[PDB]
Write a protein that binds this ligand. Sequence first.
Ligand SMILES: Nc1ncnc2c1ncn2[C@@H]1O[C@H](COP(=O)(O)OP(=O)(O)OP(=O)(O)O)[C@@H](O)[C@H]1O
Ligand SMILES: [Mg+2]
Lengths: 60, 49, 250, 239, 47, 100, 118, 118
Amino acid sequence: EAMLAKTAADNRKSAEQVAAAQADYEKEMAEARAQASALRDEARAAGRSVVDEKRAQASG
Amino acid sequence: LADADAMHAKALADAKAESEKVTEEAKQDSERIAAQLSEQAGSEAERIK
Amino acid sequence: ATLRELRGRIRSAGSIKKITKAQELIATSRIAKAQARVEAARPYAAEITNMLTELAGASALDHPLLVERKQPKRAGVLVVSSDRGLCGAYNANVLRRAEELFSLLRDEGKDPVLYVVGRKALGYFSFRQRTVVESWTGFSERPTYENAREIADTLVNAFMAGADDEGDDAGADGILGVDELHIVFTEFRSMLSQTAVARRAAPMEVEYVGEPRTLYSFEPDPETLFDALLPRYIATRVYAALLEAAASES
Amino acid sequence: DVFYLHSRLLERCAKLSDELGGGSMTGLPIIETKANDISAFIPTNVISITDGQCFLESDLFNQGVRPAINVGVSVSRVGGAAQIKAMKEVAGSLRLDLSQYRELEAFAALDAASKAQLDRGARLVELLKQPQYSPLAVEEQVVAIFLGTQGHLDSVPVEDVQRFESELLEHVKASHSDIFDGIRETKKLSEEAEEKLVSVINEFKKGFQASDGSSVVVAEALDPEDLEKESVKVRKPAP
Amino acid sequence: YRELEAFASDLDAASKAQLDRGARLVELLKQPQYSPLAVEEQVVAIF
Amino acid sequence: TGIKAIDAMTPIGRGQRQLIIGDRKTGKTAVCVDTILNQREAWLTGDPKQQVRCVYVAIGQKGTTIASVKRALEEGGAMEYTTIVAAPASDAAGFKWLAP
Amino acid sequence: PAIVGDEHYRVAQEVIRILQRYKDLQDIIAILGIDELSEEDKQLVNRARRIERFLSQNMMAAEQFTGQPGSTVPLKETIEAFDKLTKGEFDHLPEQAFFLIGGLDDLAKKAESLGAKL
Amino acid sequence: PAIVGDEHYRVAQEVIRILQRYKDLQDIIAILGIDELSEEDKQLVNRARRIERFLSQNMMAAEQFTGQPGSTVPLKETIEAFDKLTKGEFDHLPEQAFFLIGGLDDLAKKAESLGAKL
Ligand SMILES: Nc1ncnc2c1ncn2[C@@H]1O[C@H](COP(=O)(O)OP(=O)(O)OP(=O)(O)O)[C@@H](O)[C@H]1O
Ligand SMILES: [Mg+2]
């Protein structure tokens, strides 16, 4: 009886483990993509600030 | 269950590698964007002069 | 060009006016028909109520659909909406009542399980990002008893499956179920009065009255008839609700 | 002779033959309509004189469509002859397609074809939005219309179309900057240039982040008493 | 017929009859070019 | 012109007459000034077959608005190849009729 | 009928009638919606949209404005195609398949490029 | 944006867009009301009604006509309040709460006086 219960429990565990594996892979990729977008956007903002301040000081 | 554990570990390792690659690519793109924007800023300053 | 476009607008308004007047008159006739079909169904339900009362009074009050579920967690809500859209506030009021029920259900830890009749409610919930378990469509203008039969069967199966469902697990059956069956629909009080009403189809509740001169014979046993009849009562009340909704929509 | 007043003025803007030096004068007359009445006298005269018009509307301007071009009635009577080969290729039927899209949107205020047309037209309308004092080089415009009319904006949300365009153009200007050079020099988008542009678009899409958060790759309560209960009736006294 | 077709199918019986009669009469009043009819023939057609 | 909508849907060639027609505050002057400013690359090439020389004719226009247009041309470096013919609203009807 | 023939005249009259009814129904469709029309009128609206698109054509002289080369449709093929349209033989095709084409072969090819088939 | 900043310009343009969409929908609304509109359109119509009510103000010079004194709303507070409106942050409040008031404090006060709360 314990063997049958373990079989059912491990079937559930394998299914949910496959689901969690694919979900975690996708989540980590999404986190990497968000970090990349944040890096690009902060670089863009820093560049915009640099150009604005440079042109302002040149005009002055 | 052993196969599922191995597949989860493999997916985690592949995710780590892919995340490192994506981070490096995004980095390089960030430096490229910063460099081109700095060049544009210098050009604009020269125009103002 | 001002006069030209303005005359075109006049013609458009005339066409719209003619269409709307025709629709109003046809709706009047359809109100007549829907009301007539509402009286037509009164005797069967009225006397099947008596049959159910006799069975209940001559049997144990222990039907699975009749016994409340401990720790209710998922209440089934059926929203009866319309298929066409030219009704002004019908769908709007139906869905406001549905939300006035959903908030209450969430108040007591009940996560509603959504079932739909008609099309407008589908769009409303798609906008609200609330999933629909099952939807029936194409008969809100004139509902037949068959459609109520399938609706009641599906909702009752969803209710029953919850008996063996434990927590977020489905238990032995493997099909997740619900703890309650709720109906939201427009009660056709009269021509001016059409108010949405939330109604708990299940679990069945029991009232009592002290009073017997004679004892009804049963075949084969009262419990068997009660079992075979209670889902029929569920279907009959669902059909009555659909008729009321059709009349209110008209 | 007000029509003559404007016609003899506007007919002096011409493209001379090579015998007369080959010089040219391009005219951009401006006309102020009242209450969007293009049926007035001077508007009709000048419309019938010039080689097409870009009709600007206040309704489109307020909707966010800026420049507020009315694609249905705006037209150029020179057409593709006034564009480089790449622009002709990418933007062949863009005006016609947008006119058809506006027609369909008005009528369908549905089959798969209708929804596909509506989504494509919404994306294209978003693509043509442009802020003031932000001109685009002909190659950048070629790349943008390529994004639009080649189906590469179908996977991106309509709200992100403008940001997606800006970021892709910035990426191409940063790296893969030889596509712009090729379009500038040859005036046409080569097959290999199109291959590289498609690959770059796909990679950037993989990198692109949606505003909502996705990937573009490929009330008061009823009083518990008011809730009427469905109860079976039993003819017994309570226990 | 004009009023009740601008209206318009699940009509009162008399109204359905009126719609049918009106459609028939509208089709009756049609006439090809260069085809005038003698008064007797018009009488028979209207009959 | 540098404007995607115009360049893609209603392209303008050299020697063509394109009409910017619209109600008040619809962006007509914005489109024309952006078109003038977009010719700076061609001017800087130095090739007269590429260079486009610009003329702006302000008819019945408030003088302050003409000054604002001239400033917008100055900032983008478009006055180097642009001439403004001004007939402000204060000018007699003769200048207004004659400016174009 | 005397000059162009009975069939040409009949097809032209049927097309004109369908387009007139569609123009009559356009206001109602704009305000209320197409779902409130009679099934006959919905069918007629679909046919009318297809017909009005099919009346458009890719002209030779318009090449410079579209790039697509022009087409020529013989009178007999025109009459046959519009007779088929008025009878609803092409209802199953998307309306976009009828936009700036020549004869029925062009219609078939364009509908093929859109997934549908003749 | 070059003069009034990016935030003020964005809020103003969003408000203008919402009001323009409301003006466009006027044609359908005058006949059929809000019922036949899509959920997006219903939400935007309610938002536009609230916005057009909130653009009204109790003027200082109007006290002679109605007794109620005028109010002054700082520009930054106006930008913030209309950004909140355009985001649908005050959808619950009744329309009359936005009528002839000043800033957000007045909005909260009048919402309370009308049985609601901000
Ligand atoms: N593409 C655009 N994006 C945003 N704002 C724009 C755009 N084009 C023009 N505007 C703004 O729209 C307003 C109207 O512009 P403009 O003065 O050029 O229009 P107009 O039709 O010539 O006006 P008027 O009737 O005053 O002569 C100005 O604020 C301008 O900054
Ligand atoms: Mg101007």
